Symmetry: C3
Subunit: 246 residues, 3 copies
């Protein structure tokens, strides 16, 4: 249920087990988070995972996390982006294990996004368990229950609203899993590979079963994908920028 | 219901149609967001909207949005600040159209602010529809109903509490509409032009009718303005820093 | 109920009255917030609070608050860290008085953190008044009522869950009171000085009685400290990095 870094370097096209949360790391002690990127590049070079030519791209990772994620997602090539992300996860080795529960430094951005904005359907049907889970941290264990089909019926003749709400869920997921995960989601979206997209998000939910809000947003994405609005769904255009170069 | 940039340059004093959200833009395709500020300054110069002397102030806009907004609001002169804001809206051409609905990258800051803090009246009367709309995204369509006059009575003999809660609403609005919009609000506040202030916020609510939380905060500001506490209202002093130089 | 800066410089070990919120300041007018750090270092030097050798560490405080807090907490020595924090509070003289009520620029971070994440106990018992206060700003005046002992019973055989939820409360407090306050909390935690820790947080709650969410999180920390899970409590390891050098 994970991918090795060198094995991932051998593969030609991005796949689920070569995205951030599924990369096999190790420990993760206090010391490694202190390590600067020069040391991590030197480690990767000494193991012959990378060559000298690849050391600068690692040493140019900005020291702050927000800048590091922008730097990673700027890359247009699968193996380069993967190498950078792996260096960063070698410094912040708990970046994605933090997603196992309901808090942590790397979760704040996506949670802040999801809870600060509003779904169109939740504004009209705030008693739905999905909405109560997003807004109040309430009823999360039954979040995937569409009471009286209100949500489904609500979206029925409302392509634009379906598009807004599903894009808000996917934008939250983008903020959760920046970098290779988002390049993979972008790839599937651009090809309308809806079944593969749900397969990947379901793998994320299986990876982090202790993360209640994440489970709710993933179930919601699968629900929207089952609705008639999906056939004409128009994803937000920022995704096209996250695609890799031909 | 909007202002043209050059026409705005001709006018002597800031007015509603020469603030950010009311500046007439066009499209707004994928390409223009990629354009650096040197290109946008060159465009404005080629149209003779600005001269060579004005090119550096545009090319000095920092690349990140937070820095660009700080840069804009640092300006002490109406036409300079307007020109900078217009260059930025020429790059992020959807910055203010994002406010048409209930999400988007440019809305996060103000929504995070409004929902992370608390109104004094809502702590004591959390069942008020305004409070349920701010906190739970619930009852937003009846947010401007003061049940049993609880809010009004609550503020009656409480000048300090009225001041805190109205300032929290206005600070959220400041975070929504930085730059020229905030210089305009600052101008009206410093002159106690309460009717003009409400006229402007009501124009914002009319511009963005699909934005439920924004509608609620704007209705709330008009309600507070109708209360006896408004006559002695003391706005937060940061506003005085956003005024233009004499 | 506060500490003087020079008197604090005389003392050998960090104590409650030499942490940020308890440092005695004065006014705090509009002008002082405009003052750059060179001027503040010159003031402190002219009063002979510091010497010329200490001027650079003050002039190197980055201009943005987030960077200033990172700079302060990087210091490994009590008197240095205190001096830096005092310079910063001399510029943003309302940084900690902002905590007297339910909003303000310096409160956003910790409130955003506390409300974006979730307590394990609140996911299962969302009707608890503590959970309603954190999530909905509701029932804050009775937040410290554990209805039917649900919370206590919930943690009874769940050391890991107790650890997660108490660490989330303490991490929120860390985000509220960065710098010397966090070095003091780190010191008490590393020595399992649970009674002193509660004494300090209770002083914070007494300092800011108008801050409803802060009162709730402080009462909650004292409640957890009373439970059998405290004896084997394992604090998050970032705290050990905030300790001062021997
Ligand atoms: C990320 O995760 C994916 C799965 O999600 C992994 O892909 C699997 O990789 C394994 C190992 O290479 C594959 O198993 C091998 O398949 C060979 C046939 O492949 C073709 O046919 C299958 C359908 O039958 C297609 O799915 C596939 O795309 C090809 O078209 C077999 O010949 C192999 O059998 C031989 O080796 C095994 C193992 O030693 C022996 O037990 C056998 O007896 C035999 O000698 C083998 O079964 C598997 O097919 C792949 N699945 C998919 C869906 O593609 C990636 O490897 C993984 N990446 C990383 C970096 O970890
Ligand atoms: C931003 O939005 C404001 C409104 O909110 C616009 O201001 C209006 O601008 C129009 C066009 O210039 C003004 O209309 C003209 O008013 C002239 C008289 O102005 C004085 O009197 C009025 C009261 O009657 C005052 O409000 C005003 O301040 C002045 O004191 C008329 O003489 C004009 O009539 C002539 O031109 C029109 C149009 O071609 C013809 O149809 C007429 O027959 C006649 O020949 C004209 O009506 C309007 O008064 C302004 N309103 C206000 C409230 O000031 C800004 O122009 C706009 N800015 C930008 C950059 O878009
Ligand atoms: C931060 O806050 C702490 C308290 O939380 C202050 O610590 C107190 O400081 C005062 C003033 O120095 C101390 O009062 C003095 O205590 C002396 C005895 O101290 C020993 O014994 C006590 C127990 O009795 C211990 O707590 C202490 O640690 C020592 O082991 C007395 O001899 C003093 O009395 C003399 O002076 C007073 C005042 O002028 C006269 O009225 C007396 O008659 C007598 O002449 C005095 O009482 C107090 O003990 C300290 N408390 C604690 C708990 O340590 C810090 O000073 C303060 N720091 C800053 C920078 O503000």
């Amino acid at each position: 249920g994970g991918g090795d870094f060198t094995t991932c370097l051998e593969t030609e096209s991005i796949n689920w087990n070569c995205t951030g949360p599924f990369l096999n790391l190790g420990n993760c002690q206090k010391q490694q988070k202190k390590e600067p990127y020069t040391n991590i590049a030197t480690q990767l070079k000494g193991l012959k995972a990378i060559s000298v030519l690849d050391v600068p791209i690692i040493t140019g990772i900005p020291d702050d996390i927000a800048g590091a994620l922008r730097y990673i997602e700027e890359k247009e090539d699968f193996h380069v982006q993967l190498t950078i992300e792996y260096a960063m996860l070698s410094k912040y080795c708990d970046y994605y294990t933090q997603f196992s529960d309901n808090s942590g430094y790397s979760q704040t951005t996506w949670r802040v996004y999801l809870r600060s904005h509003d779904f169109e359907a939740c504004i009209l049907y705030p008693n739905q368990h999905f909405c109560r889970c997003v807004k109040n941290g309430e009823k999360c264990s039954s979040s995937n229950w569409d009471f009286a089909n209100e949500m489904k019926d609500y979206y029925s003749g409302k392509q634009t609203k379906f598009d807004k709400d599903l894009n808000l869920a996917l934008t939250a997921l983008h903020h959760a899993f920046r970098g290779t995960s988002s390049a993979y989601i972008a790839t599937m979206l651009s090809k309308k590979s809806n079944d593969d997209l749900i397969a990947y998000t379901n793998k994320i939910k299986t990876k982090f079963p202790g993360n209640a809000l994440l489970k709710a947003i993933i179930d919601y994405i699968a629900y929207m994908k089952s609705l008639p609005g999906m056939a004409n769904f128009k994803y937000d255009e920022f995704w096209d920028e996250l695609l890799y170069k031909p």
